[PDB]
Amino acid sequence: DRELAILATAENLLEDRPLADISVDDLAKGAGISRPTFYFYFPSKEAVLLTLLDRVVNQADMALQTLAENTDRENMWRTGINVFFETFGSHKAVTRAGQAARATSVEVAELWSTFMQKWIAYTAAVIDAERDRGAAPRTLPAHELATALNLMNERTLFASFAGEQPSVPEARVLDTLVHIWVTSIYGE
Amino acid sequence: DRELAILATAENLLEDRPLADISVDDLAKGAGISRPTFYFYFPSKEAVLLTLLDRVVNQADMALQTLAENTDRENMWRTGINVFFETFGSHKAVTRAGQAARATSVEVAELWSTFMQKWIAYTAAVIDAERDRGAAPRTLPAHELATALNLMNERTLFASFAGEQPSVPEARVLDTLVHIWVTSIYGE
Ligand SMILES: COc1cccc(OCC(=O)Nc2ccc(-c3nc4ccccc4s3)cc2)c1
Ligand SMILES: COc1cccc(OCC(=O)Nc2ccc(-c3nc4ccccc4s3)cc2)c1
Ligand SMILES: [N+]
Ligand SMILES: [N+]
């Protein structure tokens, strides 16, 4: 919880500016500790972002697990995509920074990669179940369809949350993604 | 065409390694010229990448214009998405580097942004035409559906071309994207 202070301060500062405009001394100051005391909890400012990102991706992941262990088909996909929209949506600054650091950082890249593989494998399993019960047609291989849908969400939510041009406005992005998932999963 | 030599050399070196592992002296050497002679044609190695990216995006754009000024609906979308797949697919190293430099470079960011807005506006116009002729249903706003489909293609092609994990294998990515465009455009 000097640790938690450092994490909270880094998330607050990331609202204002990028990681590379945040100094260790910045983080230390905000957390009420000295610089060498900072280095006791974290090896670097990049390690702090990694930890923040790790907690955010694990929060989406635990929320999706919760949903899984339990409405119409459209509403089912909408409630699952909404886990990602609300979770990353509630941590935009960390989302944007972890987005950027995937270039910068092999560790940020592998964390992102492991969780995307997990969410894709879970989307493919649900598509397969829908196909085994006769509710969805056997069109594309489920895992390939899942990979594209998941990558679409990653890129489109990142764009909306960053205010990119072009982007879907944040107020319309959930409905946009759900329409594309549902038509592509159930459509022939 | 000392200019063209510098452009060709930079595209060849980008096959081996990132821009930040390529030196001006590298580019100059490959192009058969001195360093100050290099600085006569380009202000920096970043300006060379910008130019390479500019020619690649304009090539996709002119190819899509060609198609536009002229088969079943599935095949129509497939031939248009294929412009992007073949054009960026034929220039992977430049594609990957321009992908990365969007973070690094406001100019790379604006070039990418201008062309994505243009391709989205064109996809929305064709969707609207399909809806005006009664061939597609009026579901999502055409421009929002176009923005998500185009962002999906950008992210999914970049992943396939980079060999990312996760990605759709390059041999399956065109069919994957076309299925999602067609079901989402024509589906209710
Ligand atoms: C920055 O934004 C990002 C970054 C990375 C991923 C992302 O979206 C993934 C996603 O929405 N995938 C997804 C959505 C829903 C489901 C599921 N929803 C349900 C609902 C009921 C039962 C099983 C499931 S499985 C699975 C994966 C968004
Ligand atoms: C690195 O990979 C990238 C990077 C950026 C964009 C991208 O894909 C955009 C795309 O496929 N959009 C697209 C596809 C097709 C069409 C069209 N296809 C036809 C076909 C006939 C008539 C009109 C049209 S309009 C419009 C936009 C791929
Ligand atoms: N949100
Ligand atoms: N290609």
Q: CATH number of the domain at B146, please.
A: 1.10.357.10
Indicate whether B12 and B68 sit together in one domain.
no
Indicate whether A148 and A88 sit together in one domain.
yes
From residue A6, alpha-carbon distances to A26, A44, A47, B97 in Å are: 10, 12, 11, 34
- Site from B152, B158, B174, B181 to mutate, A interface, most A CB atoms within 10 angstroms: B152
Indicate whether A141 and A89 sit together in one domain.
yes
Q: Before B18, cis peptide (omega within 30)?
A: no
> Residues A162, A96: contact at Cβ < 8 Å?
yes
Indicate whether B32 and B50 sit together in one domain.
no
> Residues A183, A149: contact at Cβ < 8 Å?
no
Indicate whether A146 and A67 sit together in one domain.
yes
- Per the structure, the count of domains in chain A is 2
DSSP A138-186: --S-HHHHHHHHHHHHHHHHHHHHHT-SS---HHHHHHHHHHHHHHHHH
Q: Smallest Cα–Cα separation from B45: which of B58, B60, B59, B29?
A: B29
Looking at chain A, which residue has its C-alpha nearest residue B165? A113
DSSP B66-105: HHHT---HHHHHHHHHHHHHHHHHTTHHHHHHHHHHHHH-
- Site from A78, A96, A183 to mutate, B interface, most B CB atoms within 10 angstroms: A183
Segments forming the whole domain that contains residue B102: 45-188
- What are the residues whose beta carbons fall under 8 Å from the beta carbon of A39, sequence distance 6 or more? A24
Task: Tokens for A1, please give them.
Answer: 């919880």
Indicate whether B150 and B86 sit together in one domain.
yes
CATH number at residue A19: 1.10.10.60
From residue B165, alpha-carbon distances to A7, A110, A131, B48, B98 in Å are: 28, 9, 25, 29, 20
Containing A80, the helix (H) or strand (E) segment is helix A73-89
Helix B142-162 to helix B170-186 angle (10° resolution) is 170
Q: Which amino acid is at A47?
A: A
CA A11 to centroid of chain Cα atoms: 15
Q: How far apart are CA A101 and CA A51, in angstroms?
A: 12
The answer to whether the Cα torsion of B22, B25, B27, B32 is positive or negative is negative
Indicate whether A31 and A103 sit together in one domain.
no
Indicate whether A58 and A25 sit together in one domain.
no
Indicate whether A84 and A175 sit together in one domain.
yes
Indicate whether A22 and A104 sit together in one domain.
no
Q: Which amino acid is at B134?
A: G
Q: How far apart are CA B147 and CA A125, in angstroms?
A: 28
> Residues B182, B77: contact at Cβ < 8 Å?
yes
Indicate whether A38 and A125 sit together in one domain.
no
Indicate whether A6 and A99 sit together in one domain.
no
Resolution value (Å, 1 decimal): 2.0
Q: How was this structure determined?
A: X-ray
Residue A123 CA: which ligand 1 atom is closest? Answer: 26
Residue B164: strand, helix, or coil: coil
Q: How far apart are CA B51 and CA B37, in angstroms?
A: 17
Determine whether B75 is exposed, middle or buried from the number of CB atoms within 10 Å of its CB (0-12, 13-18, 19+): exposed
Determine whether B66 is exposed, middle or buried from the number of CB atoms within 10 Å of its CB (0-12, 13-18, 19+): exposed
- Owner of token pair 């494998």: A121
Q: Is B184 on the interface with A (CB under 8 A)?
A: yes
